[PDB]
Design a protein around this ligand. Structure first.
Ligand SMILES: *[C@@H]1O[C@H](CO)[C@@H](O[C@@H]2O[C@H](CO)[C@@H](O)[C@H](O)[C@H]2NC(C)=O)[C@H](O)[C@H]1NC(C)=O
Ligand SMILES: *[C@@H]1O[C@H](CO)[C@@H](O[C@@H]2O[C@H](CO)[C@@H](O)[C@H](O)[C@H]2NC(C)=O)[C@H](O)[C@H]1NC(C)=O
Ligand SMILES: *[C@@H]1O[C@H](CO)[C@@H](O)[C@H](O)[C@H]1NC(C)=O
Ligand SMILES: *[C@@H]1O[C@H](CO)[C@@H](O)[C@H](O)[C@H]1NC(C)=O
Ligand SMILES: *[C@@H]1O[C@H](CO)[C@@H](O)[C@H](O)[C@H]1NC(C)=O
Ligand SMILES: *[C@@H]1O[C@H](CO)[C@@H](O)[C@H](O)[C@H]1NC(C)=O
Ligand SMILES: *[C@@H]1O[C@H](CO)[C@@H](O)[C@H](O)[C@H]1NC(C)=O
Lengths: 291, 192, 48, 48, 49
């Protein structure tokens, strides 16, 4: 890299270069600036409402909270020491601050410890089959922490239930709250329990003296909606000023890229967020903070 | 009665701008030259999606109910435009048999032909709409621009109209090749 | 078979160890695609 | 390198996440096999 | 059957459930702030109660 001839010498792995033209390198303009542009929303996301909820739902009837149009400070969660399980699939917790999403769904419920592992893509068991199913392509964070101090009592807490029987496995995020008598055999039950006619639900035995495997764990599952819409749920990351007619490393709503931003003459319709190409390559953007 | 939707029911599939390109997309679209049941109020079923076209110069049709039982103890979406405001609510309403609480959402906004696509399959309700001045269902091509993406997550298997000739068609999952002009407007489509 | 066709998305969403697996899938696919292209062009050039 | 050459065996015996990996190996192998075939045929066609 | 120039024996104490963090590409208090193994770590980790 001393001189061009030296580049050539290295390219040809030869000290002697013959007459000719030799392609040795690939020139590129390096970006001068880093641009971050996120929509100017100041609204913390109500994560406490979910995490600091006094009562959780039974796993069979898991609650779903939708999060939208707010700045999510994810540090509050991954820097907290409150959680035994904080498993993120298809995303990294550190990276979360720099990402936007159309919607986030916070699915809250309670299970026993040994079943926490069933809250993950493509797992099997009572929970994963009949109570709560995560898809194989789940892009989200699962948070679980022991709640023996809260959900267990002397005598056994039986308020939390789980579905024990079902005619088929649940589809991802399919919620079944039916109490229909399970027909285990060939005889119709007609809503009457008996032989081969069982109640589909069953209580959890939560005593403080229970094995950690059988102790209660509160679980909140965050599902990030990576869809083509204006992204509302954004990280705390600070927006900077727009720079035009320069090679810059730009970031619009967590969309990375390096390019020269120029005022466009394209006739975007009001709803259209950004433009693509013949080749399906992004080639135009509508600014988040500015129209 | 029945008419044919010659090439009506085309909308912009996503919020991406494309110009001077032919782009193939698979979505719930109205099949070309499909039957539209014509009405001059009934509890019509909602399938994958529904297309509503109303030819109403005097603008009698104010809104639609979308729901399952369309009664109490099931969240039933209501859209009622009244002059300035297109009131939208998803309360468990107790409806009338012939109409004309627990609110989890609320929003507030024949020559006249209004075409509307309602699709609830994304899991949030999508409305696409276009108004075209006209001279049955007209022969020609229009693209419907999205209006509102209500993140309501209401289960809808049936719909009613609140009131004027209106034609109802059903969206089906079909691949469509769409032509975009210089301005990125869908000007032609092919039902594959 | 990667999470995203966009290479930047993979890096922005995932930490390097995890990203490596997804990037490898993209590399394998893209390199194969280009080998296919080059081979067809060699054959086509010979015809020309 | 997949557990079974038979596609149906993989699906019936393995759960979907595990099956996808094994099917991918079969796809990669079968797709490569067909690319090899097509390439040899174009070369052979050019000779003809 | 193997030779090496140097072997480094890094010794310390943790609680049980944190043993899992002593491995390449793990996250948590230990793996982040206390002791980090490289993604390409080539060695043996030994842990006993
Ligand atoms: C949406 O609501 C409809 C109407 O309540 C549900 O359809 C019913 O499903 C049950 C179980 O299969 C049947 O016993 C009823 O006969 C169905 N009624 C009708 C009118 O079709 C439907 O399952 C609900 N869908 C969701 C997503 O919960
Ligand atoms: C894209 O939009 C431009 C601007 O509206 C259209 O150009 C106009 O076309 C009309 C009808 O031919 C003319 O009366 C105007 O004088 C034109 N305006 C300008 C500024 O040139 C163009 O036709 C549109 N593209 C299509 C094919 O619909
Ligand atoms: C829940 O409460 C704890 C204790 O007050 C707090 O540290 C945490 O930040 C709260 N959750 C929120 C507001 O995200
Ligand atoms: C904040 O948002 C409003 C949206 O109308 C806009 O007018 C204003 O320019 C924005 N400010 C910043 C920080 O760009
Ligand atoms: C429309 O309905 C009539 C009467 O059922 C039928 O004969 C005709 O084939 C239909 N055309 C279509 C499928 O659009
Ligand atoms: C309406 O809200 C009340 C109070 O939350 C609740 O008990 C009831 O279940 C809701 N509606 C119905 C009938 O589902
Ligand atoms: C339309 O309905 C809304 C909600 O009831 C009301 O506030 C508004 O005044 C109405 N406008 C009229 C009467 O056209």
């Amino acid at each position: 890299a001393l001189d061009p001839l030296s580049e050539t010498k290295c390219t040809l792995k030869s000290f002697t270069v013959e007459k000719g033209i030799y392609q040795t390198s690939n020139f590129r303009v390096q970006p001068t600036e880093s641009i971050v542009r996120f929509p100017n929303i100041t609204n913390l996301c109500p994560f406490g409402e979910v995490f600091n909820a006094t009562r959780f739902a039974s796993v069979y009837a898991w609650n779903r909270k939708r999060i939208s149009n707010c700045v999510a400070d994810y540090s509050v969660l991954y820097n907290s020491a409150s959680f035994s399980t904080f498993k993120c699939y298809g995303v990294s917790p550190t990276k979360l601050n720099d990402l936007c999403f159309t919607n986030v769904y916070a699915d809250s419920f309670v299970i026993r410890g040994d079943e926490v592992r069933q809250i993950a893509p493509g797992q099997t068991g009572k929970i994963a089959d009949y109570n709560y199913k995560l898809p194989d392509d789940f892009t989200g964070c699962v948070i679980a922490w022991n709640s023996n101090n809260l959900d267990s009592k002397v005598g056994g807490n039986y308020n939390y239930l789980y579905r024990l029987f079902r005619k088929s496995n649940l589809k991802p995020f399919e919620r079944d709250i039916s109490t229909e008598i399970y027909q285990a055999g060939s005889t119709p039950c007609n809503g009457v329990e008996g032989f081969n006619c069982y109640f589909p639900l069953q209580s959890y035995g939560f005593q403080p003296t229970n094995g950690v495997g059988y102790q209660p764990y509160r679980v909140v599952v965050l599902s990030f909606e990576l869809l083509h819409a204006p992204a509302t749920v954004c990280g705390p990351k600070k927006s900077t000023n727009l720079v035009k007619n320069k090679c810059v490393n730009f970031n619009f709503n967590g969309l990375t890229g390096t390019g020269v931003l120029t005022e466009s003459n394209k006739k975007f319709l009001p709803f259209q967020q950004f433009g693509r190409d013949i080749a399906d390559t992004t080639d135009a953007v509508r600014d988040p903070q500015t129209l | 009665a029945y008419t044919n939707s010659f090439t009506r029911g085309v909308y912009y599939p996503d919020k991406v701008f494309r110009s001077s390109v032919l782009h193939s997309t698979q979505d719930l679209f109205l099949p070309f030259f499909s039957n539209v049941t014509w009405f001059h109020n009934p509890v019509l079923p909602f399938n994958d999606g529904v297309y509503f076209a109303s030819t109403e110069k005097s603008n009698i049709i104010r809104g639609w109910i979308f729901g399952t039982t369309l009664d109490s103890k099931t969240q039933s979406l209501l859209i009622v435009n009244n002059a300035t405001n297109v009131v939208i609510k998803v309360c468990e309403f107790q409806f009338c048999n012939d109409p004309f609480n627990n609110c989890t959402f609320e929003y507030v906004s024949f020559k006249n032909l209004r075409e509307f696509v309602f699709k609830n399959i994304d899991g949030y309700f999508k409305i696409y709409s276009k108004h075209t001045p006209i001279n049955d269902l007209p022969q020609g091509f229009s693209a419907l621009e999205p209006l509102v993406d209500l993140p309501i997550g209401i289960n809808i298997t049936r719909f009613q109209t609140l009131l004027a000739a209106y034609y109802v068609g059903y969206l089906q999952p079909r691949t469509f090749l769409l032509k975009y002009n210089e301005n990125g407007t869908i000007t032609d489509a092919v039902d594959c | 078979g990667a999470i995203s066709s966009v290479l930047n998305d993979i890096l922005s969403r995932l930490d390097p160890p995890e990203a490596e697996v997804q990037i490898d899938r993209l590399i394998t696919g893209r390199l194969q695609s280009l080998q296919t292209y080059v081979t067809q062009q060699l054959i086509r050039a010979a015809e020309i």
